[PDB]
Each structure stands twice: as structure tokens, then as C-alpha cells.
Curated annotation (Swiss-Prot), chains B, D:
Protein EC: 2.7.1.39
Catalytic activity: L-homoserine + ATP = O-phospho-L-homoserine + ADP + H(+)
Pathway per the UniProt entry: Amino-acid biosynthesis; L-threonine biosynthesis; L-threonine from L-aspartate: step 4/5
A molecular function GO annotation: homoserine kinase activity
Protein name stated in the entry: Homoserine kinase
Organism listed in the record: Listeria monocytogenes serovar 1/2a (strain ATCC BAA-679 / EGD-e)
HAMAP family: Homoser_kinase (MF_00384)
Length: 269, 277, 269, 277
């Protein structure tokens, strides 16, 4: 059967607020069954046409023949890991395929960003790897790059229970930190990048940072708006940082992740 | 004799305000002479550029090394003062190199940048003046962080005469201006100078301004990337593929704008201290 | 209908002989029709099961239900632009899809390289963009990178009508030129890279070089084993180099090409 | 006083034969004294390292500047001679810097590399000694081409005592060895030091060799990238993530191999000439 797989994404990377996004090896995967009188989705969030994926697909191609689907998703909802981004992207993939739109990837990002308000999760979800973006009156501009080899450790706690202006000088400083972070990543200088990443001028964070940084992690920052914390580290520290973070006795899932090099895929299994 | 050479720089590259800057092939050259009763600099730069201890170079030098023995010096400088090409910042860097050499401070490049940025209040002329090439920087009360990258490009400078004479930003505006500089930096590193040039032309954060659209039209219609004010102005820089440099100079010279049209390259080397006959 | 698109590739890039390959915006595209008693392919090279695509697919999945297909290919055969590579890759795509193998891309390259003897065309054809490869007793090792933005001009003449050892010192020099070429490309230093590219130590070339280099092209080298010549240039020179090369009155197609960022794709149109 | 400092280098990185090399945090330091009747270098380096005009540094200097006035000099050097860490090449570079400074030749970095490579017969110690960091080079009868990149890494050096004491290749073998260095270079630039380290360990083109497998087993089983001969040997270098440096040193010291186990870093700066008190 036709399958659609879309990865988690972390947006912001600290000072890259609303600009940088990175795709991760955690996935929303769909499995398309036969045609039918109505939309349904077998899963473990609406099971019918009201589901984001379907509303999105129907927005692109209103006349899609309904289908039954099966959905598996190891991206936790409302946790800053691009669940919602991944669902919207899947919906774009659904329609592109069933109605044979043959959309360019540049097109799928434009559509996704417009739906979402912001391009920072959806561009990497479509394109894979690391995407540096901007929305300037009307259009998206983005550049894709290959993130340096490193390990990621996702400290994923439970879902959350719940400025107008900025002084010129502080705005400037915030932009230049993002600037240096980006230049540093592009030099494979993960030490300096990590140090910029933790200076986000725009809970448990200080703890996870103290622990990870003291063993040689590059950085620990909020993924998107949170509450998951992402640790960037040398590979040889991945297992040991996981173990060390698990000791904190906080109620959380501690995962080993990589950068997902490929974006949304449609394939048969 | 002992010589100190420091390059011109163009700062505030696109929305890289107080962040991005680029060293250029114009130079402040000092030739250090004999010890003496007091400081003198021989030069013919004109304007109100002093020849004594009040010259920026010397005050900067004495600020790092108060107890220095004075010298006579000879100065060549084809970086026009107050023209947006980092004349002021080259002089500060030159004073740092003077003190560092004559008082044997053995400062690292890192310390020299830190020191020059503290003096100037921003890092984006001084870091490329010390480090060469293209520097992305941040001065964050306390310290300086910077990355040096290779800029891909020739530059055509409209250099006019010296000029005769925002408190707060909406959050969203600041976020957006940041994202444009981010994209500019990322694009440069794909060698996508077309996209970079497009980002570089947005401001978001003088005499040649009313001719900017016209300079753009002409330059970009032949394949130039962008035309921008250099730093705070008033010089305008046109960024262009290297193969286009000569023909772009000639072409822009036909506009008969009141400015010298000069061809500059990216200068890869920062400030140097060396012996030459 | 399900479509498969696979790009042209240039291998060698001079001193990167048997190691570097780059995907280009010229394509072999397949269009899969309904099932049938036998394989057939409508095209403008075998029309039946003997076709490379089909022999390859059947090698992966011997039990594929036969199909009718339509094939469009603007890659010229036997011209050093990876026609044959592209057909083999298409065949891999065919089987992966029809028999639902869900092969990883790493797998498709391994399979393709094994069929071909060498990984230098097939890896970029699968992976897209620029691939630096090696075959070391048993396995492939390759790294993908993003080739610097530039324009390509393919001087494509007609099909061709038709050492054991190397002194230590010359071998070393050849490797170090490739080394410097690669380091240069990775610094976005296309001037130095082009100058290394033209020093390949392992007809019409000298002419095309004199013409292209004298206007500011980075380089002109044989694509694969030839006879097409590829010119690498600043973008603003693309149109004018095309026009200038067309004046040579040689019997050739002069094309404007880009680096294809994406590898083989399977999609509906 | 006038000082010249030049770093150690490890060349022949993987199959980057006569091509790839890397500057390291060990130094040859010269302190230049008064003009004199003849050359003398004060030092306690041992071996047959001369103190007069026959010392490599001085012969190199006189070869660029025959008419130089002699000086007395003081030499500190913690790069062990003939140990595969570019002792010889640091001395040649130091002589170039001496002549360039005392005869005011004002040679560019490019010319200094060209000159040092011509003297040594290969560029892969001397280019990183001049340029710093990691240099990929080619010496192609006539000229030199090189690219400087940032190496990602700490190094653990097994430095033993000085050692007590192919004409042609099958085409296919040469092509393959080239492809391995190509991959090594490409992998380094993805920050994939695991893959790089794997390529770096293949030869294709002394005293510590029989312990190499053992050093590998131990180092790589804790997360090191690779263990290789440095240049022609005899020192062995272990390449490892920086966070592992200290614990790797300690760990490798338990093998009780007859060699000093030293911790080195990548040195970013090439040869420097500077004043210090």
C-alpha cells in the first residue's frame, strides 16, 4: 500500500526564532487503504474528515475520493516537535498524490507555510535536514543546508497544562546572535553554535543544561515553544547523556535522535 | 622599515546591522620611523586629520600603552575619511597594532578585535579589519563572538565627497529583520549571491540615495547581485560577479554621478605588521 | 499515473575520475500503464523485457507482474551524461515500487553500483546533487554535498564512432589535484576548483576551453568518458557562453543545465 | 624582543599523501638577539642539532637572504626532531620567517609556502606550518595549490624515541587510493569524523607499529575516530572527540608502551613573527 512518512521538526534553535528549523528522525506515517463513501483513520485527534490531514488535503483538492487510512505517529502532540506541522505536510502529500497535482517541493512549502502562518517547521518537514527561512511581505525565502553530524537527545516531558516592541539595541543583539549561530553551524563549529543557541534573547532547562554541558554537550535549548528540551552533542556522548538525563527522576521520555536528511516521502510497503 | 597595513571594510551588510562586514582592497599604511621627543605623523590626507598625539591612531596606541616612547611616522591612506568604508575603524586597528608592536604586548587577533570593538562600540568594521575577508559578529555586552567565512565577488564603489552635514521596534519587525540576515548568510554559503544580494538590499533596522534605484536598475540588469549603502554611507557599493567587474565599472561611469567609481576586491588578509624596504 | 524520473549525471569532474558525480537537470522519465501479459515500452533501445530498465527490475524482483510503460528521455545515449546509469536507476525504482520493496536510498545506491561496476554516476542519480565516492574491497563509501550555485553549459556533439600501471609520483599528483578540487568546491571556490578540474592527470576540448575560459567560465571538462564537454560558469555568463559556443559551427547541441538537487523520484501526474 | 613561533604539523593524513596536513600545538620558538660576527643559536635540544650557520634555520635563511648580517638567537622547541611531527619543516619555515623579517622581503604567505615546499619537496607539513589548521595541498611541478579548511578534535600523540636506524602502482590502485582521500576530505566537511577516521586508517600508497591494532582497539572502543602514524612516523596519533581527550590520555597511558603520551590540539594559527618581553 501507498505510505506517507513525514518527520518531526524542531523550530527556533534558540535565537533562530521563526527562522531555523531542523528535521528529526521521529515520524508521522500514513497508510492509504481503499476508496470509500467517507474518510476514516484508524489510529492511537479526529478519526474522520475533521482531522488536520484530511481538512488540509480537501483544501488543496476539494473533490478527492474519500479513503480509509491507518496512521502511526511517534511524534508527541503539543510538545514543540512539529506534530501539527507534520500532519499538515502529510495532508499536502495526500492530495498531491491522490489528485495527482505533481506539486514541486517549493510549492508544497509555500502551501504549508501559508496554512501554518510560519515556514520554520514545515520547510524542513518537506525538504529535510536544516532550513534557514524568512517571510517577507508575500513570499518565503529559505535556504537548505546539511546540518553537521552530531547526536540529539530529546528530553520530552508531559504536555503543558496551560511582547509588543523591543528596544532597538536588544533587537540588534538578538539578530546578531542568530547570525553568529548560523555562521558557526556552517563552519562545522558546533561549540560556538551551541554557545549562541543557549543565548536566546527573543522549566528544567537550567538543570538539563548543567548536566549536559558539564559532560561536553554542545547545547541544550527549547524545541519550538516547548516543553521538550533538545540536547546537541558529540556522538560518543549520546548513550551516556541519555542515561544521565534519565536519572533526573523527572517524568519524561529521553530519546536518541538524529537529523532527518530527507523530508516527507511517499512510498510503497 | 617597520610597516603596518590595515584594510578598508564595509559594515552593516544587509540587515546584518552591527554584525556583518567585509574587508576591501583599500589601505591605511603606516611606516614607523625613529624614536623622538613627541609624536608626528607625516601625511597629505587633508581634512581635519591631525599630525600629532591627537590623531586617532596615536590616542588609540597611547590608550593601550601609555608609557610608549614617541615616534615619527609616515601614513599612506587611500580609504577616504568618513565615507562608509571603515576609515575610522582602520585607524583604530592601526593604533592597536602600533602599541602591540612597540610595547610588545603580543595580543592575539581575538584580543585585538575585542579591543577595537570596545573602542568603536560595534564589531563589524573592526573584526574584518583584523581578520580579513567576511566576518559575522556579535558584540554582547561583555564579549565578542565572530565567525570568519570566505566571501565568494568584485565591488564597484561610488565614492562621493564627505557628507556636508530609532529607539524601539515592534517585536515582529525585529524577528523578521533577523530572519533576512539569517537567509543572506545561509545563501552566501550556498554561493547563491543572487538570493544573497536580494536580502542584502532590504534595510529593516545621504547624498547618493536618490540615484540608488537607477544604479540598481543598471547594475542588476547586467547581472550584478545588489547595490547598497556601505555602512552608514555615503558610498554605495555594487556587488557583482568578478567577470563583470571591468565592464560594470565602465558602464556605471556613464551615469555621470558626482562620485569616483572605483573597483575593489574582497581583501582576504586582515591587518599586517611587516618589514619592507 | 505513477511516474519515475531520474536525472542525467556527469562523472569524474576531471581528476575526480571514478569518485565524483553530479546530477544534472536532464531527465529520463517513465510513465507506468496497466498490468499485462508482457512488458512493453512506448518510446523514441529495446521495447520489451530486454530493455535495461526491465532486466534490472526483474533482477531485483523476478516475479513482477508485467506492465506497459511510456518513456521520455532527453539524456542523449552514449554521450557521457549517464543515460545508462539513469536507466538502471529507473529499473531499481520500478521494482522497489511495484513489488513494494521499501528499499532505503543507501540500498538503491549499493544495488545500482554493483550492477554498474562503479558508483560515480548512480549515487548522484539516486541521491541528487554532488556525491564523492569510493569502492573499497566490498563496500561503497560516499558523501553527498551541495554543489555551489553555478550555471552549466553542455556542449553535446554526436555519439562516438568507435594504462596498466602509473609511476608513483604521477599517481600521487593526480590524487592531490582531485583532493584540492574537492576542498576548493567545498569552500565555494569555483575558480580554484575549475583550475584543478582542467588538470586531469589520470577533441574540441581545447577550443571550448579557450572560448569559455577567456570570458570567465570556471572550467570546461569532459563529462564522464565523453564526448560531451561541460562548462561550469557564473550564472550571468550562461546565455552568452551558450551563444558563443554555438558559433563554433561544430555539429552539436548546446544546452543550459543546472545541478539537479534531488535524485530519482516516483510521483503521480 | 623579536620572536618567531612555528607550529608542529602532521602530514600524509590518511591517503592524503604529500597533500593533507594539520598544524598542532607544539612549537619551535626563536628569540632573535643582537647583530654579531657570526651566527649562534643557543639551545638545549640535544642530538646533532648544530648551533651555527649549518643549522637548518640559518642555512634556509641565508639561502633566501645571502647578504644578511648574522645574529645570536635563542631557540625553544618542544617538537621532537625526526619524530613525524614536522620538526624539520618547522625549522625551514622558521628560517624563511627569519630572512623575510631581517632582510625585509615582505613575502606573502603564498610565497612562503611555495618556498618551503620547494625546499622540502612536498607541501603537507609546510603549508599548515605557515597557514595554520588543516591544509589540502598539491605540488605540481612548478606550482602549489592549497585550500585551508577548519579541522573539527583533540589528538593523543604517542611520541617514542627517534628511530634507531615504491616505484610504480597499478592504475586501479592509484584511482582507488585517490577516492579514499577524496571521501576523507568530503566527510570531514560534513563533520563525519567517524567516517573520516575510517578512511584515514587505510594506507594504500617503524617502532610503534606492532601496537597499532591495540591502540586502535582501546581508543576506538571509547569513541576515538582513528589511530594513525603521523607522517612517516614514528609517532602515532589518535584522533578523538574533544570531550574524550583527558580520559583517553589517561586510558592510553595504561598500556605502558615505551613513549610519552601527549595531548595536542589543532593549532589554528600558522607561523607568527611578533614582539614580546
Amino acid at each position: 500500500s501507498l505510505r506517507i512518512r513525514v518527520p518531526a521538526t524542531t523550530a527556533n534553535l534558540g535565537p533562530g526564532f521563526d527562522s531555523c528549523g531542523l528535521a528529526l528522525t521521529l515520524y508521522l506515517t500514513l497508510d492509504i487503504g481503499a476508496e470509500a463513501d467517507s474518510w476514516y483513520i484508524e489510529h492511537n485527534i479526529p478519526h474522520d474528515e475533521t482531522n488536520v490531514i484530511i481538512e488540509t488535503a480537501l483544501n488543496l483538492a476539494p473533490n478527492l475520493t474519500p479513503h480509509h487510512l491507518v496512521m502511526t505517529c511517534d511524534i508527541p502532540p503539543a510538545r514543540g516537535l512539529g506534530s501539527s506541522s507534520a500532519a499538515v505536510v502529510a495532508g499536502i502529500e495526500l492530495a498531491n498524490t491522490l489528485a495527482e497535482l505533481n506539486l514541486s517541493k517549493e510549492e508544497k512549502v509555500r502551501i504549508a507555510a501559508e496554512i501554518e502562518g510560519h515556514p520554520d517547521n514545515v520547510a524542513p518537514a518537506v525538504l529535510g535536514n536544516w532550513v534557514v527561512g524568512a517571510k517577507l511581505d508575500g513570499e518565503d525565502f529559505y535556504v537548505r543546508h546539511l546540518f553537521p553530524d552530531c547526536a540529539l537527545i530529546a528530553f520530552i516531558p508531559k504536555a503543558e497544562l496551560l511582547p509588543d516592541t523591543l528596544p532597538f539595541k536588544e533587537a540588534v543583539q538578538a539578530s546578531s546572535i542568530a547570525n553568529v549561530m548560523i555562521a558557526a553551524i556552517l563552519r562545522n563549529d558546533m561549540t560556538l553554535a551551541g554557545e549562541m543557541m543557549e543565548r536566546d534573547l527573543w522549566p528544567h532547562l537550567a538543570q538539563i543544561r548543567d548536566v549536559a554541558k558539564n559532560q561536553g554537550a554542545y547545547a541544550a535549548c527549547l524545541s519550538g515553544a516547548g516543553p521538550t528540551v533538545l540536547v546537541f552533542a558529540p556522538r560518543n556522548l549520546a548513550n551516556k547523556l541519555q542515561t544521565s538525563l534519565q536519572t533526573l527522576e523527572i517524568d519524561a521520555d529521553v530519546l536518541l535522535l538524529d537529523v532527518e536528511g530527507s523530508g516527507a516521502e511517499v512510498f510503497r510497503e
